[PDB]
Write a protein that binds this ligand. Sequence first.
Ligand SMILES: *[C@@H]1O[C@H](CO)[C@@H](O[C@@H]2O[C@H](CO)[C@@H](O)[C@H](O)[C@H]2NC(C)=O)[C@H](O)[C@H]1NC(C)=O
Lengths: 49, 49
Amino acid sequence: FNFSQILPDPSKPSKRSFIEDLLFNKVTLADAGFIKQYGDCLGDIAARD
Amino acid sequence: PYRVVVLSFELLHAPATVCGPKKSTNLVKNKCVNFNFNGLKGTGVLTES
Ligand SMILES: *[C@@H]1O[C@H](CO)[C@@H](O[C@@H]2O[C@H](CO)[C@@H](O)[C@H](O)[C@H]2NC(C)=O)[C@H](O)[C@H]1NC(C)=O
């Protein structure tokens, strides 16, 4: 019984398995947003989001 | 004889003609300051964009 897809991958930053990585990149709409060390948007060269 | 001049400006402000903004001041950065760049009222911190 093969289990490569769902078992965790040591050869990756953070031990996130293949399928959950696929989901995490399929959503890509949260864009974190949980103040991942926010307070860095003092000088908004861009459109400030 | 004396030299006399009459300064006669009319009223009601509809032909707003002469006026003066004047009192152009200096600038500050990275400081909690009130800004009046062009008559706009507001406060905050100024930086380079
Ligand atoms: C379980 O399935 C995966 C599916 O990818 C297998 O991974 C492949 O392994 C072969 C072995 O040489 C590689 O050539 C392929 O490139 C791998 N697939 C991918 C997409 O890279 C894995 O080998 C299977 N498990 C076992 C024990 O064979």
